[PDB]
């Protein structure tokens, strides 16, 4: 009901993601601070299916998609539950923010506890690219950092 993912990797990317959700029907509050990114950029931020890091961020699987839909924007009606959009980085490569979400949960059958958060190397096209991958991953590219979502105090 309070969870955290410490992001780590081998590309200088690093950070912490905080989840808060008080009750089953309430929205989760996502708060992140990630550094080591490109400056002045937009980078893909998502929930991948597996909290598996056997071989690094590549071990995490595809996007969390309990409802079998297509990749989209956090604001679209048609998205994967793990679709958190893009995070915007500053002049120093720091992405900092917070938001609320109704699809992402800590409680119940679709819980994300035990899953992974990924920060991509590229930008998420929200599925409005003209490529077929756009509808899978949004073409956000590789995985500089990821972290398992764990239960905290």
Please confirm, yes or no, whether 52 is among the known catalytic residues: no
Encoded tokens for 123: 């930008």
Residue 101: which of 76, 120, 127 has the closest Cα? 76
CA triple 14-19-20, angle to 5 deg: 155
Site for a second copy contains 26 (CB under 8 A): yes
Please identify which of the residues 43, 79, 80, 115 carries the catalytic annotation: 80
- Whole-angstrom distance, CA of residue 116 vs CA of residue 28: 16
Find the residue with minimal CB distance to Cu ion: 46
* 71 part of the active site: yes
The radius of gyration computed from the CA coordinates of the chain, to the nearest angstrom, equals 14
* 46 touches 142 (CB < 8 A): no
Q: Which of 5, 7, 46, 89 binds Cu ion (CB under 5 A)?
A: 46
Q: Are 84 and 47 in contact (CB under 8 A)?
A: yes
Q: Which does 118 bind (CB under 5 to 8 A by kind): Zn ion, Cu ion, a second copy, none?
A: Cu ion
In the annotation, is 120 catalytic? yes
- The answer to the question of residue 24 lying near a second copy (CB under 8 A) is yes
Least spacing, CB of residue 102 vs Cu ion, in Å: 19
Q: Which residues contact a second copy (rule: CB under 8 A)?
A: 1, 3-4, 6, 16, 22-26, 49-54, 59, 61, 65-71, 105-110, 113-116, 130, 132, 135-136, 147-153
Which residue ranges make up the annotated binding site for Cu cation?
A: 46, 48, 63, 120
């Amino acid at each position: 009901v309070q969870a955290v993912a410490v992001l780590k990797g081998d590309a200088g990317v690093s950070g912490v993601v905080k989840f808060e959700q008080a009750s089953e029907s309430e929205p989760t509050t996502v708060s992140y601070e990630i550094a080591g990114n490109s400056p002045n950029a937009e980078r893909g931020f998502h929930i991948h299916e597996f909290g598996d890091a056997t071989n690094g961020c590549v071990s995490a699987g595809p996007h969390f998609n309990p409802f079998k839909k297509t990749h989209g924007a956090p604001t679209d009606e048609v998205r994967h539950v793990g679709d958190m959009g893009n995070v915007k980085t500053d002049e120093n490569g720091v992405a900092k923010g917070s938001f609320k979400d109704s699809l992402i949960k800590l409680i119940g059958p679709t819980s994300v506890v035990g899953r992974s958060v990924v920060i991509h190397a590229g930008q998420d096209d929200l599925g409005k690219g003209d490529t077929e991958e756009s509808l899978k991953t949004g073409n956000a590219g590789p995985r500089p950092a990821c972290g398992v979502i764990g239960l905290t105090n």
